[PDB]
Design a protein around this ligand. Structure first.
Ligand SMILES: CCCCCCCCCCCCCCCCCC(=O)OC[C@H](COP(=O)(O)OCCN)OC(=O)CCCCCCCCCCCCCCCCC
Ligand SMILES: CCCCCCCCCCCCCCCCCC(=O)OC[C@H](COP(=O)(O)OCCN)OC(=O)CCCCCCCCCCCCCCCCC
Ligand SMILES: CCCCCCCCCCCCCCCCCC(=O)OC[C@H](COP(=O)(O)OCCN)OC(=O)CCCCCCCCCCCCCCCCC
Ligand SMILES: CCCCCCCCCCCCCCCCCC(=O)OC[C@H](COP(=O)(O)OCCN)OC(=O)CCCCCCCCCCCCCCCCC
Ligand SMILES: CCCCCCCCCCCCCCCCCC(=O)OC[C@H](COP(=O)(O)OCCN)OC(=O)CCCCCCCCCCCCCCCCC
Ligand SMILES: CCCCCCCCCCCCCCCCCC(=O)OC[C@H](COP(=O)(O)OCCN)OC(=O)CCCCCCCCCCCCCCCCC
Lengths: 598, 504
């Protein structure tokens, strides 16, 4: 358990070796290096978990060195490990190992193979840094590394320019969110004087006794950073566009790494949000609005990858709703289960794309349940876990815990929004299932983890996060029955429209209000249009207006004045002698007059 | 006592490069490498001998090593050198970038390389003398005598693809800007000396004697204004910035003049050493104007750098934006902001050095610098696109590189002092990321937009790869372990900050 830094070192060494290989190595040796680095990180994580459960479940600290020290400003390179950090590290390493070996199968015969594995190794290393950070500055380093690896992996096929545009847009919105996170860091250091999480928790109530406004600003800025990284309101406009890249990078982004960072940030800084309950309720409201918006956006989508984008955004909104109703254990349990079934669904979607000659439109392919049965079975169990199918999956237990925590704390509206979101996600997921499919080791492991076997695993969150308030057993059973009935009714209703030949779908879809709503929800409720017309177009306009460097011409004005004055004065040197004598007389008159007036 | 030699051995080395040119064309480059290796060795010896890590703050002045010699005793003018942590750090950076500049022009078998090397080390000795000298007349003399070889190198040895008229115009614009700012700085220095004489009665041009000078408010403001005009042209600070992209674009195509000449910013060192301690009250009153000029400089440089079709011009505007950040850092009166400013200047020097070297080698490979004529170059070369990706990542403020450390300690100190300028500067960092991504995508990613980018290009040799990897390793070590650099400059920065905030 003293090898905590090995989970950072080994992916870094793999990234360095695969980057300096420059593709001269064969596919076998480079794949061995990359997936072996991630597998050794996962095995070291398993050993760390074993000695963590064999030492009494105590928070461990490994201070490597001191990052910076300017007087009072002391920031250290210290790693920490608690139940939340162990859960995050375990899910990141395991899901990354499965995705890495599936990518070793998947990326064969492709250029940039070693570059792909180096970038994903750096992604894994940066997220291990993020989840094993004692203070907010090392957490910001992991945040920035995760964002840079997201940018470098989304635009992997650099030849096609829309991959590059998607990567640039994703990096821009994540940098805006990280600037909000930097605002949170500046406020927290200015008030409390430290960036360590534990010491911030200790000195927050002592300093914010008579005034609790800058703490609200700091928690609001933390929420802004979280919604920037997790693709929530109002910075969700990069997800579906940024699935322009390959499949395993998408599975890594949506399952374990990119979208769960904000959830981990809110869960880790739970005390500061607990002493500012209005910001926590704002987190819950943002999650509810984003999950409903994501469900309505995934209704009218025609691409399987964008459907999975808005499904990921909907479950991230579910996690933010759980964090806003003070249900932290439910949020982390949903994080792990969503990582499992979304990794399974993304890998099976990549298998679908490879089997159907790189076709992504769901309406083109049909009757795929009999062409290949195994991928259909994995897609079925992944959709059932995503639709919260009762008594056999893990997403049902995760969402049941989330809505139980929402109901037990008096948030009736958020629980209603969660029920509507569950109906919505069952409806669109089985819509996509029936449109696509009607008309091996990682897949098996993720299929096993997608069922109730993954629900048997509980995170060791006792002692780090506060316990969710217990609901009454009769109301708990009522909530479970209502959620199961809602999911089953949604699945049967989606089978009623989309399994047979479509009557009601085309009757209301071809209507003018129906076409208006479909075009509105297809473009993510007009947020890309708003950000293009409010933030991007004035930027291009100001750049085009300023490209002539107006300040340079403003400062070159006196050079033009000097040239004009010199050319004007040179006209007096005409070369005439009588003019010279007349000018001498004029100057004599001028100096005599100036001497007389004074 | 090693400081006079530290200034002199670049000049003797340049004279030897000129003299031993008759021994052969390939001789003066070796002489220049030997004498810059010796200069860097003496700078590192002063680093290891000064004991900068365990040095307290005894108040201004506090010099680790000083040298005195009378130069013009009529005015009380002395060759007066003094080294402390900040001056030592900039001298070490000067030696490193001079070694890189000599190594970067290694492939020139031209007829008159001896005078090229002589002007190069004249520039290097001038900027070293600017860092070391504290006497006002000697500091001004170095400040304006490093200017002539810059002009001659830009005008004669500059970009071969451009006409002679454009190079002459760029060099003359740079010279007029910098020497007029030197002249108004000389007016401020002379008026300060005459005020000190009227107060006391002794001809002193010394920096330590001029600190204890009683000035009324309004006169000290004008002296500070002249000093800031000089250090605003040389930073550059908008609108006094038009010389910089013109001098960078018409610099020699090897790229040595950019690294040796302009990539060490003497203006921020002059603000820390001279503008802040000599005029504390005037700088405290001028802090809103200077900080808002820094804000305008950051956003203006970002808006230029997004809109340039020339990569060298783009990197010049990156320099404008980063030094706008440093200008915001100088006028806060904070320990953390000053230390972040020092880290940011060092990291910006290293990152812009890597960017300029890689841009020069890219121009050598493809014989053009227009960003509309290149694209999809990742599959065309071996090492250059990845290293330029690393340096473009470094220049946007990425952790693991020293730019993030410097910028974030700048912003932490600034937010401790002023919050609104801090938040606007962080949005300027967002703009910096925007222009870095734009340069990366318009340079190396996409499809080939011409025929010269559609063919396989030769790779970089071992020497340039070694120097670029050295810059990469230094940037990584600065980002992950900046503590020796922070401890080296902890005493002088503390003395400057205590003098600035204890007199108001
Ligand atoms: C705290 C723990 C860490 C937490 C996360 C930290 C994140 C921040 C740090 C980011 C570092 C830089 C990341 C981006 C690197 C971009 C360059 C890259 O990866 O290039 C890949 C390229 C190989 O690609 P390929 O397509 O195969 O090339 C064939 C044709 N050229 O590769 C090449 O062509 C060769 C290699 C190019 C440069 C690679 C990166 C160099 C910098 C890092 C290593 C420096 C050396 C190690 C020692 C440092 C000092 C101890
Ligand atoms: C992962 C993070 C590193 C990412 C790659 C960059 C390479 C490393 C750059 C920073 C090196 C830091 C370092 O060595 O600091 C010196 C430190 C000892 O200095 P001090 O802070 O005084 O520690 C007191 C001793 N108990 O030394 C130590 O504390 C020794 C152990 C440090 C931890 C391992 C260092 C190597 C990590 C990268 C291996 C590849
Ligand atoms: C809503 C409440 C919260 C608000 C938070 C603050 C605002 C967030 C704004 C998010 C903006 C998201 C969209 C950004 C897309 C960038 C990528 C893209 O689409 O690039 C397309 C285009 C590619 O072209 P390029 O590489 O420039 O080459 C020229 C040849 N076409 O490249 C371009 O056209 C360049 C586009 C650059 C856009 C810069 C935006 C800066 C926004 C600063 C906001 C400051 C707020 C204070
Ligand atoms: C209370 C909240 C209830 C939310 C769930 C509503 C479920 C029923 C309506 C959605 C299902 C439906 O009818 O979908 C049809 C169409 C989208 O189906 P699509 O696959 O895009 O059409 C293919 C045609 N070539 O859908 C559309 O084109 C838009 C239909 C909008 C119906 C009203 C929604 C009000 C909110
Ligand atoms: C903060 C503001 C207040 C304090 C200012 C302190 C002074 C220092 C900082 C400002 C310096 C400004 C310099 C402006 C000129 C820079 C050089 C330039 O633009 O040259 C252009 C041109 C030569 O280029 P070319 O195209 O070859 O010539 C045309 C062919 N006939 O040139 C020519 O053709 C003629 C050039 C003549 C010499 C240059 C003009 C000097 C005029 C006096 C300026 C004094 C400062 C005035 C206040 C600032 C400006 C408003
Ligand atoms: C275009 C490029 C060139 C720039 C323009 C040319 C230079 C312009 C300089 C303008 C100076 C305006 C001075 C206005 C007040 C003059 C009368 C006065 O009362 O002076 C005060 C003082 C003399 O009175 P005294 O008894 O010595 O009081 C000192 C007490 N300690 O006076 C003194 O002791 C000396 C005062 C000197 C003031 C500073 C002068 C230089 C400032 C920097 C350059 C200009 C701004 C940029």
């Amino acid at each position: 358990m003293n090898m905590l830094a090995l989970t950072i070192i080994l992916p870094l060494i793999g990234f360095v070796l695969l980057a300096f290989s420059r593709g001269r190595w064969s596919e076998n040796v480079s794949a061995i290096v990359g997936v072996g680095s991630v597998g050794l990180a996962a095995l070291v994580t398993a050993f760390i978990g074993v000695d963590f459960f064999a030492n009494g479940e105590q928070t461990y600290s490994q201070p490597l060195w001191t990052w910076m020290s300017v007087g009072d400003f002391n920031i250290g390179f210290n790693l920490v490990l608690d139940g939340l950090s162990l859960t995050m590290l375990s899910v990141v390493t395991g899901v990354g190992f499965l995705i890495h070996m599936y990518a070793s199968w998947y990326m064969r015969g492709e250029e940039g193979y070693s570059r792909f594995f180096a970038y994903t190794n750096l992604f894994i290393a940066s997220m291990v840094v993020l989840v094993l950070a004692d203070n907010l500055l090392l957490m910001y380093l992991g945040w920035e590394g995760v964002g840079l690896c997201s940018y470098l992996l989304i635009g992997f096929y650099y030849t096609d320019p829309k991959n590059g545009a998607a990567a640039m847009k994703a990096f821009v919105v994540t940098r805006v969110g990280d600037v909000f996170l930097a605002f949170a860091l500046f406020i927290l250091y200015n008030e409390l004087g430290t960036l360590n999480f534990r010491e911030m928790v200790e000195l927050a109530p002592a300093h914010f006794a008579d005034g609790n406004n800058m703490l609200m600003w700091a928690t609001l800025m933390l929420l802004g950073g979280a919604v920037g990284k997790s693709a929530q309101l109002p910075l969700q406009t990069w997800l579906a566009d940024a699935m322009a890249g390959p499949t395993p990078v998408s599975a890594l982004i949506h399952a374990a790494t990119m979208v769960t960072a904000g959830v981990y940030l809110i869960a880790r800084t739970h005390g500061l949000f607990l002493m500012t309950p209005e910001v926590l309720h704002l987190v819950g409201i943002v999650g509810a609005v984003t999950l409903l918006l994501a469900g309505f956006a995934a209704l009218v989508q025609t691409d399987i990858k964008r459907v999975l984008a808005y499904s990921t955004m909907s479950q991230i909104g579910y996690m933010f709703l759980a964090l806003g109703v003070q249900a932290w254990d439910a949020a982390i349990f949903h994080l792990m289960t969503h990582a499992f079934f979304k990794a399974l669904l993304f890998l099976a979607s990549g298998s679908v794309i490879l089997a159907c000659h790189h076709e992504q439109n769901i309406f083109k392919m049909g009757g795929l349940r009999k062409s290949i049965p195994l991928v259909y079975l994995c897609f079925l169990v992944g959709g059932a876990a995503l639709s919260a199918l009762p008594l056999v999956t893990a997403g049902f237990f995760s969402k049941d815990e989330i809505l139980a925590g929402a109901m037990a704390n008096g948030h009736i509206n958020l629980m209603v929004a969660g029920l509507v979101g569950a109906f919505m996600t069952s409806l669109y997921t089985f819509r996509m299932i029936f449109i696509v499919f009607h008309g091996s080791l990682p897949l098996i492991v993720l299929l096993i983890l997608s069922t109730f076997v993954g629900a048997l695993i509980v995170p060791p969150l006792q002692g780090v996060l506060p316990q969710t308030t217990e609901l009454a057993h009769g109301s708990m059973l009522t909530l479970e029955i209502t959620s199961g009935v809602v999911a089953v009714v949604g699945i049967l209703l989606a089978a009623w429209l989309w399994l047979g030949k479509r009557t009601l779908v085309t009757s209301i879809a071809n209507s003018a209000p129906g076409r208006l709503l479909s075009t509105w929800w297809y473009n993510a409720w007009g947020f890309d249009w708003l950000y293009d017309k409010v933030f991007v177009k004035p930027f291009l306009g100001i750049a085009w207006l300023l490209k002539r460097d107006p300040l340079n011409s403003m400062m070159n004005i006196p050079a033009v004045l000097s040239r004009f004055a010199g050319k004007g004065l040179l006209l007096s040197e005409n070369g005439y002698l009588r003019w010279y004598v007349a000018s001498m007389s004029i100057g004599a008159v001028v100096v005599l007059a100036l001497l007389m007036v004074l | 006592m090693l400081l006079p030699w530290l200034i002199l051995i670049p000049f003797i080395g340049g004279f030897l490069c000129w003299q031993t040119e008759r021994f052969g064309v390939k001789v003066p480059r070796w002489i220049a490498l030997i004498t810059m290796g010796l200069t860097l060795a003496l700078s590192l010896q002063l680093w290891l001998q000064g004991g900068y890590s365990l040095t307290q703050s005894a108040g201004i002045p506090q010099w680790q090593s000083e040298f005195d010699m009378p130069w013009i005793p009529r005015f009380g003018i002395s060759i007066h050198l003094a080294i402390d942590g900040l001056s030592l750090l900039m001298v070490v950076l000067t030696g490193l970038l001079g070694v890189l500049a000599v190594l970067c022009s290694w492939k020139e078998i031209e007829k008159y390389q001896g005078f090229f090397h002589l002007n190069l080390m004249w520039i290097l000795g001038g900027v070293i003398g600017v860092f070391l000298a504290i006497d006002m007349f000697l500091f001004f003399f170095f400040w304006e005598m490093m200017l002539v070889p810059m002009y001659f190198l830009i005008a004669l040895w500059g970009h071969k693809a451009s006409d002679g008229k454009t190079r002459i115009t760029a060099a003359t614009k740079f010279f007029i800007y910098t020497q007029a700012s030197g002249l108004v700085m000389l007016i401020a220095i002379l008026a300060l000396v005459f005020v000190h004489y009227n107060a006391t009665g002794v001809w002193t041009f010394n920096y330590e004697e001029l600190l204890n000078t009683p000035m009324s408010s309004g006169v000290e403001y004008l002296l500070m204004l002249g000093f800031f005009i000089a250090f605003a042209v040389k930073m550059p600070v908008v609108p006094l910035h038009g010389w910089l992209p013109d001098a960078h674009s018409q610099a020699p195509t090897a790229g040595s003049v950019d690294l040796a000449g302009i990539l060490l910013k003497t203006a921020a060192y002059g603000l820390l050493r001279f503008s802040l301690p000599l005029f504390p009250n005037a700088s405290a009153e001028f802090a809103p104007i200077a900080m808002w000029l820094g804000v305008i400089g950051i956003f203006y440089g970002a808006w230029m750098a997004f809109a340039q079709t020339d990569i060298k011009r783009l990197i010049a505007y990156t320099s404008v934006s980063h030094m706008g950040f440093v200008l915001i850092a100088i006028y806060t009166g904070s320990q953390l902001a000053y230390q972040g400013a020092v880290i940011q200047m060092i990291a910006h020097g290293l990152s812009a050095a890597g960017l300029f070297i890689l841009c020069g080698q890219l121009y050598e490979r493809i014989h053009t610098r227009d960003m509309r004529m290149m694209g999809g170059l990742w599959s065309k070369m071996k090492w250059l696109p990845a290293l330029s990706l690393f340096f473009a990542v470094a220049t946007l403020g990425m952790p693991g590189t020293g730019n993030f450390v410097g910028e974030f300690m700048i912003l932490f100190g600034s937010f401790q002092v002023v919050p609104v300028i801090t938040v606007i500067s962080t949005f300027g960092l967002v703009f910096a990321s925007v222009y870095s991504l734009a340069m990366l995508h318009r340079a190396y990613f996409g499809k080939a937009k011409s025929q010269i980018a559609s063919q396989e290009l030769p790779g970089m040799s071992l020497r340039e790869l070694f120097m670029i990897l050295l810059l990469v390793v230094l940037l990584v070590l600065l980002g992950f372990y900046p503590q020796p650099i922070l401890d080296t400059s902890h005493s002088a920065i503390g003395n400057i900050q205590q003098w600035f905030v204890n007199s108001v």
